[PDB]
Design a protein around this ligand. Structure first.
Ligand SMILES: CC(=O)N[C@H]1[C@H]([C@H](O)[C@H](O)CO)O[C@](O)(C(=O)O)C[C@@H]1O
Ligand SMILES: CC(=O)N[C@H]1[C@H]([C@H](O)[C@H](O)CO)O[C@](O)(C(=O)O)C[C@@H]1O
Ligand SMILES: CC(=O)N[C@H]1[C@H]([C@H](O)[C@H](O)CO)O[C@](O)(C(=O)O)C[C@@H]1O
Lengths: 420, 168, 420, 168, 168, 420
């Protein structure tokens, strides 16, 4: 029951190798190897057929075939019940003692989850036949007393090294739009009418490596951006995005909460392919995807959702609940404090988080020099119940960046306290 | 014969490494000498790996099979996939080495109990792997009868008693 | 030409491994392994077919198929001309000398005999393909002189360790009766009419571990008793003998000689299954098998035929020829000496054996205390031409036990000399 | 991305020993302990040895294939003949060894060039052999993510750039 | 050519380990270096293990076969069962090793004799096993012709003369 | 471009093992073997099919099938595209460094040539699949700089040990005559009329080991003699040549030049089979093959063509161009110097060679003692531009033997200078 700091969608998690069923259900057998003798157990693949195991929480949606298709999307597993790989264990017993060699079949546990609002809505476990486990020890005394012990609970145990590799996969019921031309410094993409019926992804790449502001018109809905895993190197053409149908995706930043008006500040690289997931919008008027290259130190925010904070004319408590970034990653908040701009400090502000701990940096956003600029006003070591007042100029725009340091809850809560 | 558990029927895993009486040398043996490494093995498949059922009035073969394969390893499914094992030993200098092979088994029991003792007992031996005994010899040397011959089923490992209650 | 101290019937003898035909008839081949090189010869079972050899003295009765059925009864040999077992020999030559590796196929020699009155009436030899022989030695000089040597006699030589494992098997032309209920302390079994047509076995077990007297009504005919080999452990039911159709049998005691009126004194165990062979009786009146539990020191005779000695009213020589027990085992003789019982010693007796040597213990059998009792009168170190007189009370019953010490002849001869 | 050679199209051998992103553990892994020798291998044949084509507008799969197989190894003809490879490692005393296998590949490219840089590029990965990574572990030990997972294609040997001009 | 035995026809086993002229390298050879262990072998079966009959006026092939297989090993029955042999050698450090394989044979003769000498002789070579010659080399080194090439049939073991009289 | 000191005909040359195509065309693959790990590459022959390579200068005459038939004649290669042989390479990496294992397929290069007048008229190269090559070295740094290198020329490279085994084979378009009876000391063979249509070979053996003079009637045409390779041992009959259809032949002496009137002096052995090639003779009158056993020291010439020198009545230059023997082998010249025999020395002679260097021995041939005799007149260390005059008796017959010491040209030129 750990916090998964990821947006909604499908994830395939490799939960490690060396899984095997309880009660010697996967025991191949045991060799007693006498002193000065070698013993060996071989899986020579004289038949190629293997026996994967499978469990599911909903068999209609997450069927074995469906789960296998996701395992292919994530890890490119080609063959699920045939192997040509062999494994063998060999061991010579010492001159003084006999040895016991116990060999088991094993599996790699892959977990497919449908993750929605911090909950696992659908769950499937696929056990891929692996290359075995051998336990050697001193041969037990045949005169050893026989302890009557109950058969333990039905299920799996893990005997391999700790592993938890999470890989996101494209939801194959959501269409993929492609911007074939690598985008220039400023680009606007008209979102087609199919967005009315379900969410979609837009596959694109940038012409020039740099930091970019990504947002919808009017900053709603929020966006999610991923990177295609392993797209670098491989095929290429000058002014054309090379699609290899890579469906394994690495989450960068963004969130699902529908009222989170925002934009993304992300460091994008020329040699990579990216996916933006645009949620379903039921409106009849056309929405747009706006890309804008950013020069200057707004790169400090690189890889962050910037949440625009609204209705702050009232004083005191102002909470904003958002999907927490993972430890070490950013979430940001933009504040245009109320009042007319001269140089009076507007009702002193105090900034804190509620669920998750974080560092915290306050910037004033310069509006119109020649491009945007951030001036560091103050840093904060801890954000949880922080109450160091700060006076901001009314009418000025400020950005507060939170770098997460402990992940207690799925959501991080941000409070912009307006004091006097 | 005493068993400290409640009244009813049980399926029990008696462990791996059981060898059967009178079939010690059925697979044959191997002779080497003078620093030679001798190897013997077997790729057990379904045609040479036969289970032995010793059923009883209340527990027939299908009843033994289904209850063993539900709790413990499914040996029918496992039998379809060839698996190899082998042993090797280097013969000593200036002496001869004899080495013989026999199948090992998992012993399973299905027991009925009245709260003091086992009233009924069916037995299943599932082919597991194998076991070699070796001996150094010369033509003039007489050797123990019991080296060649096992008169009663026994376990070359420690015996086990891992139990599950059928129909709880 | 050794003495086989066993009753009539069928026996399968494993006469050892490493048998091979003469004149390199079973040579796989020879490797010349040069210094600092390894050489290897493999039997990888790419074909499963093996080639057993077979000879028989009578091909109509002891046919190959019949012999194989006996080998199965005795050793549970399942497969006679197919193997999945592999064997391999590997050897590295030293830095200074070349080595020769000679590899042969080998066989295990199983011998089926029909043994009747101390003679082999029918004989079959089955050679079961085994796991080979390797002979390594210093590589011979190719310049070595060529000695013209005649091809030696056609047949087998044995190159494995000495072995002679004798296993009796049930004669499958003799029916098996079963007493399903474990016998109580006293049991009487009515022998069915089929005994008129051929001998039979009766399979039984005892309810309580102890010593038992087994005899026919009027002590004729003599009985043979065997133990089923490997019946212990395995399946079981409370009041029911568990038949696993075990046909491998270990002779305990008893004999075939038709005039040997006797009973058996045997130590029987609850966890075992036993066979009694009742010979053919041509009478039209029903015979019975009588079991009687014996408490007290008549257990001294445990595992022995007790021969009742008749017509001893004459004085001097009284010979009794019987199948000799093996070295270390018992044969016993019961004597009710002639005359009326007061306390006069009846014409002094002297006890000796003729063919085989043995220890010898004289007991007086107490008749009616509360159960039988043996009083040790005297022991004798050697029995062959022993002439230590002893005076026995007329009308009293004495038992003489012979523990065999050298097995010169199939029959042991017992002489109860009645002196004056 | 700079390439010092004349204008035109080229077929190029980028070398052996390439491993592909996200398929590190597809073949499974192997666990041993206490001085045991663990062996893993594979007899690659056509049904489990699949080439990966990443073609481009001007260079389609048949064009990649024919030009690679004319200059370099004919992998189609070679695929008909089974070939084995295996790795072995002895587990340390009193510790556990994990070992996993993945296919290696020859990387081939077909590149178009304008005298400063590669304008176009198709890629072919031909199954070559295999590569094992191993690690010692215990149940309590956390280990690097990057041990289990390769996010970008790379070469475990030195990369090569052996070129031939197509239609000179 | 002198033979000290009576007048008549004989079948004779001349021994194992015969190699044949001009076919030294027919099976090919193997090159290794720098501490590599090189292994070569063969699973001889009927399609690649051909007997060589060199018959004579009075002794035809069927006559050679039947008399050899009656007294000595039945090579026709033996040929139906695959059998493997292999040799291995570790290449030295910083030098190259060449290793080539050839079949060995049992040589059988059927001879007619008049009490001083062999008047007639048919020869049969039965495939037995194999034999490797090895040599260390470098590219500049010239090596003996006779290493690669056997001009006359010979025996790498000691020759034998084990005889049986046909029709006594 | 070496001088082949052989007569016209067909030759199969094994040019060695370890051949492989350039540009890693025969690379099986490379293993990176980490420290304290073993790596192995196996060719297990799970399929028996191999892929020989073949090139030819004339595909109609030297077709693959034809070339294979010659390879069989020469080396008895049985199977050309199927193998049951396995090869494997195993290597453990040291504790400190990783190792690279590169394995290739390899071939043995067999070359079939049609050799005519010192030229290769037809040429075929057959590459027989061999048992592989392994190259191990220290694992290269993956950070090693990538050198852009051009694909090298298409063809083969040799990585095995140096080898050049030349074996002549019978031209299968030339008939073979057989003298079944081992020839006595003096034999004459009538050459059949088929010699009008093409050259032929005559297979024969000698009854008695010795030196023999072989010649046609009138010493034209010249003869070539070969030995059948491997004919010794094997089948035999008293007075009958045992043909094993051995077509591999070793050249002894003789030449093709049509005007070279000559005879052969050869050491022939009883246990061998020989072939004499008689060229096509277009005459309508029958020619003969004359064998004559020679006792005495004419054996000094053993294995030599003896060229009879004609038209020497003129003085000065007298050149004779003949196929040069190989280094260490003989060519001989017979001279009956002009003039009537008394004991005047005929116009002093001087003997030299032109192309090839040689030793040189001058004999006077004794005509009619009881068989021929050679008297050594003088030896010469070097023959190239040798000018040591010698005076020979007019009418006497002299033989000059040249043992070749350097092989610069296909032909050796002999000059018998007649001085004054
Ligand atoms: C219009 C607006 O800005 N609404 C914000 C409100 C209120 O400001 C807050 O509940 C009162 O403090 O909070 C959220 O619902 C929240 O809890 O995440 C987010 C939302 O963006
Ligand atoms: C009726 C009786 O008791 N007969 C016994 C007789 C005589 O007592 C003996 O020959 C004379 O001494 O001997 C036997 O035939 C014998 O030799 O074994 C056994 C038999 O039990
Ligand atoms: C008839 C005769 O004997 N001719 C010989 C001639 C002349 O003697 C020579 O050219 C003049 O010096 O030379 C040859 O053609 C030659 O060059 O080999 C060989 C030939 O045997």
């Amino acid at each position: 029951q750990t916090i998964l700091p990821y947006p909604n969608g499908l994830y395939v998690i490799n939960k490690g190798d060396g899984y095997m069923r309880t009660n010697d259900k996967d025991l191949i057998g045991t060799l007693l190897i006498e002193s000065s003798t070698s013993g060996s157990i071989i899986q020579p693949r004289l038949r190629n057929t293997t026996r994967p195991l499978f469990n599911t929480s909903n068999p209609t949606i997450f069927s074995q075939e469906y789960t296998e298709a996701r395992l292919n999307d994530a890890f490119n597993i080609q063959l699920f019940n045939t192997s040509t790989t062999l494994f063998k264990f060999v061991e010579e017993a010492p001159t003084n003692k006999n040895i016991s060699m116990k060999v088991y079949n094993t599996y790699e546990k892959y977990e497919l989850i449908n993750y929605q609002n911090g909950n696992i809505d659908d769950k499937a476990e696929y056990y891929l036949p692996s290359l075995g486990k051998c336990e050697v020890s001193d041969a037990p005394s045949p005169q050893a007393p026989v302890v009557e012990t109950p058969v333990d609970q039905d299920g799996f145990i893990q005997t391999g090294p700790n592993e938890n590799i999470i890989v996101g996969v494209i939801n194959p019921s959501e269409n993929i739009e492609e911007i074939s031309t690598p985008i220039p410094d400023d680009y606007t993409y008209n979102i087609p009418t199919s967005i009315q019926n379900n969410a979609c992804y837009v596959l694109f790449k940038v012409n020039t490596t740099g930091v970019y502001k990504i947002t919808t018109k009017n900053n709603l809905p929020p966006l999610i951006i991923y990177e295609a895993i392993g797209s670098s190197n491989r095929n290429m053409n000058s002014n054309n995005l090379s699609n290899d149908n890579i469906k394994a995706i690495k989450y960068i930043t963004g969130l699902n909460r529908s009222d989170a008006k925002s934009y993304l500040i992300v460091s994008l690289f020329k040699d990579k392919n990216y996916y933006i997931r645009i949620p379903q919008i039921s409106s009849s008027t056309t929405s747009q995807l706006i890309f804008k290259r950013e020069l200057g130190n707004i790169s400090d925010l690189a890889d962050s959702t910037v949440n625009i904070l609204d209705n702050l004319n009232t004083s005191g408590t102002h909470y904003y609940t958002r999907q927490s970034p993972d430890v070490g990653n950013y979430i940001s908040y933009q504040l245009t404090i109320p009042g007319d701009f001269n140089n009076i400090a507007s009702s002193i502000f105090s900034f804190r988080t509620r669920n998750n701990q974080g560092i915290g940096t306050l910037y004033r956003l310069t509006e119109s020099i020649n491009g945007y600029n951030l001036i560091t006003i103050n840093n904060y070591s801890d954000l949880l119940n922080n109450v160091e007042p700060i006076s901001l100029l009314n009418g000025a725009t400020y950005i507060f960046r939170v770098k997460v340091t402990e992940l207690n809850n799925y959501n991080i809560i941000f409070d912009a306290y307006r004091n006097s | 014969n005493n068993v400290n558990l409640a009244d009813g029927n049980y399926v029990v895993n008696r462990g791996d490494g059981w060898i059967l009486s009178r079939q010690n040398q059925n697979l044959g043996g191997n002779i080497s000498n003078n620093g030679c490494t001798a190897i013997v093995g077997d790729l057990r498949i379904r045609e040479t790996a036969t289970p032995y059922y010793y059923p009883t009035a209340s527990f027939n073969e299908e009843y033994i099979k289904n209850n063993v394969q539900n709790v413990f390893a499914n040996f029918t499914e496992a039998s379809e996939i060839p698996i190899g094992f082998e042993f090797s030993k280097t013969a000593p200098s200036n002496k001869s080495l004899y080495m013989y092979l026999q199948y090992t088994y998992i012993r399973y029991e299905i027991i009925k109990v009245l709260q003091n003792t086992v009233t009924e007992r069916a037995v299943l031996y599932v082919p597991s792997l194998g076991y070699v005994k070796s001996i150094e010899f010369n033509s003039e040397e007489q050797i123990d009868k019991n080296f060649y011959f096992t008169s009663q089923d026994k376990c070359i490992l420690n015996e086990k008693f891992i139990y599950k209650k059928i129909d709880d």
